[PDB]
Design an enzyme around this catalytic site. Structure first.
Site, PDB file in Angstrom:
ATOM      1  N   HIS A  41      -0.465  -2.156   9.220  1.00 41.05           N
ATOM      2  CA  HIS A  41      -1.248  -4.486   9.346  1.00 41.05           C
ATOM      3  C   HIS A  41      -0.307  -4.846   8.305  1.00 41.05           C
ATOM      4  CE1 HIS A  41      -4.074  -4.131   6.833  1.00 41.05           C
ATOM      5  NE2 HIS A  41      -3.851  -5.405   6.703  1.00 41.05           N
ATOM      6  N   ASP A  90      -2.927   3.073  11.193  1.00 41.19           N
ATOM      7  CA  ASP A  90      -2.641   1.198  10.210  1.00 41.19           C
ATOM      8  C   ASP A  90      -1.736   1.878   8.900  1.00 41.19           C
ATOM      9  OD1 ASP A  90      -2.625  -0.746   9.428  1.00 41.19           O
ATOM     10  OD2 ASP A  90      -4.112  -0.684   8.059  1.00 41.19           O
ATOM     11  N   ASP A 186     -14.370  -2.969  -4.497  1.00 39.52           N
ATOM     12  CA  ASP A 186     -14.484  -2.707  -3.507  1.00 39.52           C
ATOM     13  C   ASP A 186     -12.317  -3.136  -3.422  1.00 39.52           C
ATOM     14  OD1 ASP A 186     -13.605  -2.383  -0.474  1.00 39.52           O
ATOM     15  OD2 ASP A 186     -14.762  -3.943   0.693  1.00 39.52           O
ATOM     16  N   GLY A 190      -5.411  -8.027  -0.300  1.00 41.85           N
ATOM     17  CA  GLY A 190      -4.444  -7.889  -0.647  1.00 41.85           C
ATOM     18  C   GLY A 190      -3.898  -6.667  -1.733  1.00 41.85           C
ATOM     19  N   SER A 192      -3.858  -4.586   0.376  1.00 44.19           N
ATOM     20  CA  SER A 192      -3.523  -3.938   1.427  1.00 44.19           C
ATOM     21  C   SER A 192      -2.512  -2.783   2.091  1.00 44.19           C
ATOM     22  CB  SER A 192      -3.624  -4.397   2.863  1.00 44.19           C
ATOM     23  OG  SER A 192      -4.854  -4.615   3.531  1.00 44.19           O
ATOM     24  N   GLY A 193      -2.320  -1.128   2.489  1.00 43.75           N
ATOM     25  CA  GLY A 193      -1.202  -0.680   2.093  1.00 43.75           C
ATOM     26  C   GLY A 193      -1.211   0.264   0.605  1.00 43.75           C
TER      27      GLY A 193
HETATM   28  C1  4T0 Z   1      -7.174  -6.791  12.492  1.00 49.77           C
HETATM   29  C2  4T0 Z   1      -6.468  -7.804  11.121  1.00 49.77           C
HETATM   30  O1  4T0 Z   1      -6.916  -8.466  10.716  1.00 49.77           O
HETATM   31  N1  4T0 Z   1      -5.143  -7.223  11.072  1.00 49.77           N
HETATM   32  C3  4T0 Z   1      -4.668  -7.475  10.417  1.00 49.77           C
HETATM   33  C4  4T0 Z   1      -2.738  -8.207   9.757  1.00 49.77           C
HETATM   34  C5  4T0 Z   1      -1.816  -8.978   9.289  1.00 49.77           C
HETATM   35  C6  4T0 Z   1      -2.869  -9.307   8.010  1.00 49.77           C
HETATM   36  S1  4T0 Z   1      -1.728 -10.103   6.938  1.00 49.77           S
HETATM   37  O2  4T0 Z   1      -0.788 -10.570   7.459  1.00 49.77           O
HETATM   38  O3  4T0 Z   1      -2.506 -10.465   6.077  1.00 49.77           O
HETATM   39  C7  4T0 Z   1      -1.486  -8.867   5.792  1.00 49.77           C
HETATM   40  C8  4T0 Z   1       0.830  -8.845   4.765  1.00 49.77           C
HETATM   41  C9  4T0 Z   1      -2.084  -7.907   4.829  1.00 49.77           C
HETATM   42  C10 4T0 Z   1      -4.728  -9.704   7.875  1.00 49.77           C
HETATM   43  C11 4T0 Z   1      -5.046  -9.950   6.627  1.00 49.77           C
HETATM   44  C12 4T0 Z   1      -5.333 -10.620   6.710  1.00 49.77           C
HETATM   45  C13 4T0 Z   1      -6.288 -11.288   6.939  1.00 49.77           C
HETATM   46  C14 4T0 Z   1      -7.080 -10.027   6.723  1.00 49.77           C
HETATM   47  N2  4T0 Z   1      -6.559  -8.788   5.890  1.00 49.77           N
HETATM   48  C15 4T0 Z   1      -6.550  -8.296   5.993  1.00 49.77           C
HETATM   49  O4  4T0 Z   1      -5.565  -7.258   5.640  1.00 49.77           O
HETATM   50  C16 4T0 Z   1      -7.748  -7.126   6.031  1.00 49.77           C
HETATM   51  N3  4T0 Z   1      -7.629  -6.045   5.003  1.00 49.77           N
HETATM   52  C17 4T0 Z   1      -8.692  -5.298   4.337  1.00 49.77           C
HETATM   53  C18 4T0 Z   1      -8.728  -4.510   3.988  1.00 49.77           C
HETATM   54  C19 4T0 Z   1      -9.138  -3.551   2.846  1.00 49.77           C
HETATM   55  C20 4T0 Z   1     -10.387  -3.846   3.096  1.00 49.77           C
HETATM   56  C21 4T0 Z   1     -12.138  -3.183   2.145  1.00 49.77           C
HETATM   57  N4  4T0 Z   1     -11.506  -1.992   1.507  1.00 49.77           N
HETATM   58  N5  4T0 Z   1     -12.952  -3.721   2.112  1.00 49.77           N
HETATM   59  C22 4T0 Z   1     -13.346  -5.344   2.640  1.00 49.77           C
HETATM   60  C23 4T0 Z   1     -12.523  -6.033   3.550  1.00 49.77           C
HETATM   61  C24 4T0 Z   1     -11.136  -5.176   3.173  1.00 49.77           C
HETATM   62  C25 4T0 Z   1      -9.694  -6.242   4.571  1.00 49.77           C
HETATM   63  C26 4T0 Z   1      -7.852  -6.924   7.094  1.00 49.77           C
HETATM   64  C27 4T0 Z   1      -9.493  -7.262   7.820  1.00 49.77           C
HETATM   65  C28 4T0 Z   1      -9.835  -6.641   8.964  1.00 49.77           C
HETATM   66  C29 4T0 Z   1      -9.352  -5.818   9.796  1.00 49.77           C
HETATM   67  C30 4T0 Z   1      -7.223  -5.217   9.461  1.00 49.77           C
HETATM   68  C31 4T0 Z   1      -6.910  -6.019   7.897  1.00 49.77           C
HETATM   69  C32 4T0 Z   1      -5.174  -8.654   9.187  1.00 49.77           C
END
Ligand code: 4T0
Ligand code: CA
Lengths: 254, 55
Positions: A41, A90, A186, A190, A192-193
């Site tokens: 993602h 993912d 949590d 930011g 992510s990955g």
């Molecule tokens: C589906 C979808 O929203 N896709 C997606 C694709 C791309 C992107 S982005 O382009 O900005 C990229 C560069 C990160 C993004 C970015 C921007 C929107 C949110 N986001 C995330 O990454 C979220 N990540 C997390 C990860 C761990 C979490 C945790 N442990 N606790 C609570 C919340 C958590 C959230 C997230 C929330 C919900 C689903 C997926 C990711 C989302």
């Protein structure tokens, strides 16, 4: 990372910072000198594939200390089962243009065997999660790399222990829960990955990837991590594969 | 045998035909004569923190 602490410089040596146009994008985990494991993602909004940089040996974003090693991302391999805009499968495996040099500050995390990961590592309660993501919900991201210890939860317990919020994705066999429901601790968007690293008999292994959740440290909601154990064979076959022209490659899953 | 307490192994575990068990290690480690312990063969093996190991 919400509710964590600063990971002392050199203590999270496998942590990768993924940049796109010099801007913070995601985390990653170095598993050897040329490969990095991240989340698929992270690349959902990429148009500029040639501007992807992985930074190893990073700690403080405001200062260059000479321990950082930047490498162009040569390839981004995503499973065929990953649908952009969704949460399942993912994972992403990145090939660096040239290897990193192993130093006290640049060290890979062990990619475990499916067997050992499933039958042993899955039962280690506490594992470390890291990244320079948000320190609070709707707050600023970290300048110094943060780390948090999180308890792993069984999916049935994760479904039972969580506030039944509608339109929420299902927790699959390719994901797992970890963290707290009190809204205190949590990993967030930011991070992510980034790695979910597990200690077993004096060595750390990759068991999960910062994937998704509700908002950021939301009450009654745990963090969701990619179940890395499902991808071992997949990652290994690809690590043995010759590079293909192009940055984005989609590989069959399984 | 491997399914229970990692079969005594420090790292990896293989079950064989009968009551046989083989411990193995990740690349950059060699197995010790105890047949369970893994020792690093390299300067930077995976999963070890050099500042903490050199302390
Ligand atoms: C589906 C979808 O929203 N896709 C997606 C694709 C791309 C992107 S982005 O382009 O900005 C990229 C560069 C990160 C993004 C970015 C921007 C929107 C949110 N986001 C995330 O990454 C979220 N990540 C997390 C990860 C761990 C979490 C945790 N442990 N606790 C609570 C919340 C958590 C959230 C997230 C929330 C919900 C689903 C997926 C990711 C989302
Ligand atoms: Ca720096």
């Amino acid at each position: 990372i919400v509710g964590g602490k600063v990971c002392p410089k050199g203590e999270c040596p496998w942590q990768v910072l993924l940049l796109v146009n010099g801007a913070q994008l995601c985390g990653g985990t170095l598993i050897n000198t040329i490969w990095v494991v991240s989340a698929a993602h992270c690349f959902d909004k990429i148009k500029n594939w040639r501007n992807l940089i992985a930074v190893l040996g990073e700690h403080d974003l405001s200062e260059h200390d000479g321990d950082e090693q930047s490498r162009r991302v040569a390839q981004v391999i995503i499973p065929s089962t990953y649908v952009p805009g969704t949460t399942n499968h993912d994972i992403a495996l990145l090939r660096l243009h040239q290897p990193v040099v192993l130093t006290d500050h640049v060290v890979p995390l062990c990619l475990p065997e499916r067997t050992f990961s499933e039958r042993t590592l899955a039962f280690v309660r506490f594992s470390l999660v890291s990244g320079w993501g948000q320190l609070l919900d709707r707050g600023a991201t970290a300048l110094e790399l943060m780390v948090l210890n999180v308890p792993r939860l069984m999916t049935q317990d994760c479904l039972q222990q969580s506030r039944k919020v509608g339109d929420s994705p299902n927790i699959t066999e390719y994901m797992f829960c970890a963290g707290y429901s009190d809204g205190s601790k949590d990993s967030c968007k930011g991070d992510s990955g980034g790695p979910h690293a597990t200690h077993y008999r004096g060595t750390w292994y990759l068991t999960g990837i910062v994937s998704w959740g509700q908002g950021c440290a939301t009450v009654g909601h745990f963090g969701v991590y990619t179940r890395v154990s499902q991808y071992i064979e997949w990652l290994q076959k690809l690590m043995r594969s010759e590079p293909r022209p192009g940055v984005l490659l989609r590989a069959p899953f399984p | 045998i491997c399914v229970n307490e990692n079969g005594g192994c420090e790292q990896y575990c293989s079950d064989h035909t009968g009551t046989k068990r083989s411990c193995r290690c990740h690349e950059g480690y060699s197995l010790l004569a105890d047949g369970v312990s893994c020792t690093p063969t390299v300067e930077y093996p995976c999963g070890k923190i050099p500042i903490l190991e050199k302390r």
